[PDB]
């Protein structure tokens, strides 16, 4: 007889309307809601489902007079349908069509109701109900709550649907992140700031051992885990200080690793952060602790490890508890601009990029050459253009970066390795952009490099290639630019 | 008044329209286009008097997105059996299908009570049954809808780039009002963040030719305040302009002029006109202007668009351009030209920031240079600086914090003279900037220096006394800040901090 159009909202009613796609927990929370004096409404199989378990409840039909006071309503598995099938029609049949039209409205009279859109809440509403609790500022926040579970719900349908049929780059875009905690600061201290995911990737893969992460902390740990994490199971330690590397190297185990990264430039590495594609023990622990570095994010970490930094109070470290680093790869990157945002495909260094390269010199380089290459480029690929990296041996020697001119950063680079005591002969270089002139080459050979790796692409790649040639060096254009601002 | 939503039902080839919008823009024009295909008209509130009123064809429905208060609005999400047109002919008014569904949507109790309810469930219920309705929400499409409607093209893919349309227009509404409800009780930083872009265009790629790319806008500031009077502006370029405008905007109605190249400054001046602003502008390093982006605020008249043009830019963008300006690049092909058809340069002054990283984004306050930063630093030294190096500090200070970091700004009477970035060490990056200075033929000699980062050592002070530097401004808050003092007594110089840091990545 009564359906949910005879339904309106009324203080004091002491009637709840249960009505769920997600039927977990439903059973315990009407028993709950019941022993707290409400009568209970439901439709269809949450109906069933709740008479089954000896609820006393009566059930109204759905649309497709009576107060309530209490909303109990979740939405159709878009998302879970999407993942799971490619099927178009079935896929539309799971987006829910009046579920949202009554969590919207329940929301907006939540002066005289409490709307309930997510199982994970059943618990905490219950014991707010059983102390007297359930008061406007308690309805207030699941209103807006309820209006956040609507909003992305649509931006979720939005988003799959703009990627299915128009490349990723639909008429309205959003952005969606949930909130996985606030920082101390932003950039500044006198910025506010916090850190937001896509899915579950930060809240199910780091877990602080000691200390929190600042704003400018994760950015560094994001460049520092991108770089540690691009050589499989190799012993890689990835050194950065304000968003640029200053320490790259893969040795024979992870404590050597650690002391030819920071050859390159221990200055910098004072107040660094580290990254570390494996386990932190107890003797990398000691040798990282003999400078006071700000951040130390492992793979995994040694209780023993841990305590070698019990007197730091400003060092954070976290672990991801797994025998490798763990990243993210995001298939759109975006950058704030006052106004909005300018919205791209991520840049990525092909795992064939200098496999496919194509060799423009006499020359040819070793094996051990192109490992060193390999690293160069996915270094220089990272880096913040424009910019020139040193290679030798499986560790970085020399970074350059910043300047107007590559002449003057590769000078730069070349006095910083001179102060640091690092012989250069026999090293490889990688650009991210074009070399425009022989004059790059030439300056190259003041320290012996034997090997290089660029974009190509100059109107002087002749005479680039010519230069190469005087001095006997192998010399790759790889067709791919990896500028990044 | 007689006829309710609950009479209503979605139904292929029902040839009749239900018109009910907040955005009014074209509604009559459209509902005379459809009474002409042979529509029959439904309408509330005030779209129906207004389509009544201009001798439409119209029959009234009782208003479902205005606002006992139930639970949800009666609106069928089924569809009725299609049926041909002459089983219509054969054969009533308790039961109408509806195939046209043109909706659009729109103190704290006052906020709260005007959420649309009826609006967005008709909206989405329509989108739904997309293989048998069309649903409209934006005016924009009218004419487009018209004419597939006359060519007989209105067909399933047609009406699903609708339905996209649809959910996008009801996810933006939901997002701003959880945006806002975040906005006035969690500070802004919420539990779900909304990031939310209309795009403004498709750029020909993304910072590499091989990542493709787009420009987003929020509430229309891209669309409304820009326009291209000659090329199309790249994703690099649009980063360039973001950079060189916010510069350029940072000093009222002052004749600024900024160029930048790769993302920073290589040219900024405040002179006593535009065409002396950006001669000496050009004057600090001339080789990396060339192929630059120039931000004038103010009018690019045939003056200064012929000093400019002695030389190759790739943008210019000025607050207002003059017919005879633009004439002056008709031959050049590179070069891009935008306006904001306004006396003086206009930002958005966005109230957050955001970064991404892997797996989402970091969220934060947008930084500033507050109005009184330089006012209220303390004078750390003997001497205080003249009223002429207190303005060139203030621009000095401004363009420190617009740079990446870690960086060091030298300005002289209101002109920047040199500038140092990138490397590991502001000694470094200080000697580079003195190399390019000495090159351009500047004298620094009574130039003032900005940093926002604090000084470490006297070291710093040691190498700014071989330029002449006369004052210097900081944030301060190094340990040995009073042998930073001492420097700076020995060779009387002007010393002040801020308190207040801009580091920028």
């Known amino acids: 007889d009564l359906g949910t159009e005879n339904l309106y909202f009324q203080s004091n009613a002491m009637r709840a309307l249960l009505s769920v796609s997600d039927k977990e927990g439903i059973v315990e929370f009407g028993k ?23 609820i006393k409840v009566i059930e109204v039909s759905d649309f497709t007079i009576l107060g309530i006071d209490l909303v109990c309503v979740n939405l159709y598995p878009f998302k879970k349908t999407t993942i799971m099938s490619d099927d178009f029609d079935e896929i539309i049949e799971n987006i829910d069509i009046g579920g949202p039209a009554m969590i919207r409205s329940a929301a907006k009279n939540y002066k005289d109701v409490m709307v309930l859109c997510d199982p994970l809440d059943y618990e905490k509403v219950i014991e707010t109900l059983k102390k007297g609790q359930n008061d406007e500022n308690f309805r207030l926040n699941l ?15 939005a988003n799959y649907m703009n ?18 905690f606030d920082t101390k600061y932003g950039e500044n201290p006198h910025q506010k700031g916090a850190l937001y995911e896509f899915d579950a990737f930060f809240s199910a893969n780091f877990k602080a051992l000691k200390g929190e992460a600042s704003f400018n902390n994760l950015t560094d740990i994001n460049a520092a885990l991108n770089l540690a994490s ?108 006052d106004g909005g945002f300018v919205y791209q495909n991520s840049d990525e260094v092909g795992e064939d990029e200098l496999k496919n390269a194509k060799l423009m010199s006499q020359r040819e380089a070793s094996k051990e050459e192109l490992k060193d290459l390999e690293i160069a480029m996915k270094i220089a690929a990272f880096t913040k253009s424009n910019n020139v990296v040193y290679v030798k041996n ?4 020399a970074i350059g970066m910043g300047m107007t001119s590559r002449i003057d950063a590769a000078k730069a680079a070349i006095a910083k390795a001179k102060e640091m005591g690092l ?63």
Do not use: W
Request: glycine content about 10%.
């Open 394 to 397: 499986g560790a970085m020697v």
């Open 163 to 180: 990627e299915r049929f128009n490349g990723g780059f639909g008429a309205s875009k959003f952005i969606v992140g949930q909130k996985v």
């Open 230 to 337: 691009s050589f499989d199971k190799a012993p890689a330690i990835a050194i950065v200080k304000h968003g640029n590397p200053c320490g790259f190297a893969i040795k024979e185990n992870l404590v050597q690793s650690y002391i030819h990264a920071l050859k390159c430039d221990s200055v910098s590495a004072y107040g660094g952060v580290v990254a570390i594609n494996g386990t932190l023990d107890e003797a990398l622990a000691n040798k990282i602790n003999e400078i006071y570095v700000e951040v130390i994010i492992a793979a995994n970490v040694d209780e023993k490890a841990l305590a070698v930094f019990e007197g730091k109070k400003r060092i954070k470290i976290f672990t991801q508890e797994s025998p490798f680093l763990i990243r993210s790869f995001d298939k759109y990157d975006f950058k704030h601009i």
């Open 143 to 157: 209103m807006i709550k309820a209006y956040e579970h609507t909003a992305n719900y649509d931006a979720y349908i």
């Open 32 to 54: 709950e809601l019941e022993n707290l004096g409400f009568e209970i409404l439901s439709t269809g199989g949450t109906f069933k489902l709740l008479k089954e378990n000896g």
């Open 423 to 485: 012989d250069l002969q026999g090293c490889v270089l990688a650009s991210e952009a074009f070399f425009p002139f022989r004059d790059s080459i030439d300056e190259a050979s003041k320290v012996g490099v034997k090997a290089i790796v660029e974009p190509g692409g100059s109107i002087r790649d002749d005479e680039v290639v010519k230069a190469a040639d005087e001095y006997g060096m192998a010399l790759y254009f790889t067709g791919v630019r990896h500028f990044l601002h």
